[model samples]
Target: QETVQRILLEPYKYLLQLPGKQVRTKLSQAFNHWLKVPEDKLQIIIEVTEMLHNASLLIDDIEDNSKLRRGFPVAHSIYGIPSVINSANYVYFLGLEKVLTLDHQDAVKLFTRQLLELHQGQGLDIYWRDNYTCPTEEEYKAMVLQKTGGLFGLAVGLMQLFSDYKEDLKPLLNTLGLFFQIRYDYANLHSKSFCEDLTEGKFSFPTIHAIWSRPESTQVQNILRQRTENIDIKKYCVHYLEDVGSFEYTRNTLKELEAKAYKQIDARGGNPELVALVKHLSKMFK
Candidate 1:
């Protein structure tokens, strides 16, 4: 059984061994300041969230046909896609099983709902990319809430079940989710991969803004369709995005979201740790 389990989990374990930001774990710890769930139960929730988050990344790389994750070869590149997919799906069920240990009547139900929302968000993101459709900014925000906020909600929601401080942190969670994703989009353009999102033909926040801002031109649309890895071509697209002020707009939006999140956190009687986490994340752009 040990050998069988190891063989089946090799792909999942491969990705898990890689370094990750562990932002989800940190977010759980920050929220614990408010939820105050027992340390043992909090550990289980953190583990379950990690399981689901990493598993989702496995599938995300496959769906995006990504070449790298965290500057390393994606799991699917090392393991066959079929095996990686199976392994990721297996971890998801394992996450559900772990959640069951929480022993709340709503535990399984909450898990199912949040997982479904995550998939829904992922599906829309994939559909938009595959179909070469650029979603409106409003549409993009809604999808981010589902995709990014799903896990955020799952962690806090599970904590609430074990605590007495239930005051609906959804608004703040969603704002932080938006902040995280948009900052990610901005970083992809300016950082190591050098506009990797454009190469992936993703409808990222900046690209979406660029598209809408110049609906009359098909230059961005055409470049995305090519999915070119040529540094020159990618740079050209990035320059075009800059000319359209997409990056500037993205920064402004991120700042607004950050301030909004801070206001929400303060209103909740203030969480110094959570505020500090947000500040740390903002250092990428601020």
Candidate 2:
């Protein structure tokens, strides 16, 4: 027992001290409302996953030059990209081992697919940013599903394993996944990360919507054509429907999607614990 803790803790010390508000404290509390798993088992889930998530963030910092993570210098900025990536990978592998060796095969399958989907989404996300030309909103949605939706799906589905719900929870999970992804996009617009995508003239759902909403006079076409890393975000964000007015639009849209997600969960009504778990997590987003 102590050995496992020692083994896991040794590789993840840096992650434990990293600088942001932990997203999973609510998730952990939400899980406990229903799941009656023992301490060691639950700790395994939290510890390994936290490690993997930290790894992903480390990689994102290097890929995005994210200066701050958990409120401090990103793992790559502090440890260097090579070291950051290596450690992140080390933590991720350790998570895989914990999920597989300690938990059931079901848990491993659930966990692995989410990670793979996220990787796929990130690749597409990077690609889309490099190429300014975007197609339809559906295309942008696909990217959202791949990148952000995957993690939401993981959290929801993994929670399901602890108990039996009367019906399929995947759809419900996917809906929440969609809602969360949209919210993340909304958050990004106001966040420093927005520049990362916008400066590159990357076509995102909101950006695409903003473009579609603009008059021909707005000349979004030319703006995208001239895209470079030096983009003036202050000017660019004006018509994007995000800054002041557009921010509300994004917020309202997320609210609508979240309502849609909750409706499905309520309609099912099998596991009160599941409903409670999901509902509590949903409130945190607000």
Candidate 3:
């Protein structure tokens, strides 16, 4: 092991300092919390995580019609949407290349196949949410898995690529990712958090679960039909979620997923601090 000063550390100091870069910075923070690997190796993980995660932000903003991110102009707003998309692609390619930089040997295509699955997952997510109408809760979850959960899946898969861990750990990590995505959906849809995604007709699991489980009252039926961000519609949706107790349901669900995710981390092998990071982030749901 290198000296603490030379270890390069899991949370590289500079990356965490980028203001409003909280998303990627938090990811590095989580890795720092969980990992205890060589400085050079840890550095690669931090670089790869930032590249992949930030690329998702770039592509997602255009898709979401978002103009602001981290208090700065979004990538598409500064450059054309197409160019912004290309920037994401460039980073994605770099993430792929970074995987190969690993010091390992394998007979299998190893992470290559996982990356392909992830790309498919992203495509599936786009098709599910934007191109096609996700009419069912199952459909919504599947799409969510592709879009956000895929990255979580990849994050867990990182342990596989670099560590001598059990294969079963993959399922637990993917489940945790799925759980977190669902948790995020809850937060984004809830009134206290960002409610914009709902107006775009980007129905999330928590919102849909609320709608789907509701009785066929005229009010319940009317809530789902809301297409415009009209004040009445927004008020009704908020009131409806409140009335139906969906918010509490969503929070409780997040806790359940967080617990399951951490149980795996504590039982199986993992860097204590990075696992702790996962725990802290997961439990922050509310």
Candidate 4:
């Protein structure tokens, strides 16, 4: 039985051994300033979110057909897709089991809802990429709310159930989700090697903007369709985005979202630590 357990968890454990940003854990810790849930419950919530986040990444790497994650080969590459997929799905249930330990009547309901939202958001993302469709900025934001904000919502939503400070943090959480995702898109284009999102053929924020800004031109679309790893072609696409001001536009959007997040945070009587976290994340490529 012990050997069986280890074998079942091999893929999951292998990924866990790699370095990760642990941003969700930090975000929850910052929000604890407001929710103030007991340490025991807070730790459980953190563990559950970490499990879900890491599991999702395992699946994401496979879906994206990614070569590397955090500069190392993706889990699926070494463990094989079937085992990694099963391990990730197994962790999802494991996370749910942990949620049950929270002992709230609504715990299961919250878990179900957020996981549904996450999958729905992921489905939309996959659909858009597979179909070669570029979603409108508003549509992208909605998806981000579900995909990224779902996890954010799960952590804070669970914390709220255990606390008395309930004023609906969903709006702010959604905004932060948009901010995080867009910044990630921006960084992918500007900072990452060979423009990873371009290779993935993802319709990220800047690419979406680039597509819409000049609808008559299919230059960006053609490049994306090729999913080329050629650095020269990727460089050309990057230059095209730069020439058309997509990067500047993404930066401006990030500024707007950051300001909006601060406004919402201030309305809740302010969270300096959360604000600092946002600042830290926003410092990339600045």
- Per-residue lDDT value at 83 in model 2: 57
TM-score, structure 2 vs. true: 0.75
| lDDT tens readout by residue for model 4, 78-131 | 988999999999999989989999789999999898899899999999999999
TM-score of 4: 0.97
Candidate 4: stretches off by over 4 Å:
none
Per-residue C-alpha lDDT of model 3 across residues 1-286, encoded as one tens digit per residue? 4464322222222223436525544554454334434557667766776767777767667666665665556666755666666556766775777867765654025555555666676676556556534447666656656556556555545644555434465556566667767766765665422466555556566666666776464454344345455666766677777778877777777777777767776665555655655666664564
lDDT of candidate 1 at residue 194, scale 0 to 100: 70
lDDT of each: 0.89, 0.62, 0.59, 0.90
Q: What is the TM-score of each candidate against the true structure?
A: 0.98, 0.75, 0.74, 0.97
**Candidate 1, residue 190: CA error in Å?**
1.5
* Candidate 1: residue pairs that collide: none
Which pairs of residues collide in candidate 4? Answer: none
Query: Who is ahead in TM-score, 2 or 3?
Result: 2
Please give, for residues 1-286, the per-residue lDDT of candidate 2 as tens digits.
Answer: 5576554344246666645556554555454544445566666667766666667776766665455544555555555566555666777777777777555668888887888999998887667555655556777677777776676666556655765543565665566656666665555555533444454455655666766666464555566555545547435664456443545666677777767766875666544555565565456446
* Best of the candidates, lDDT: 4
In model 3, pairs of residues that clash are 33-273, 33-274, 34-273, 34-274, 34-275, 35-274
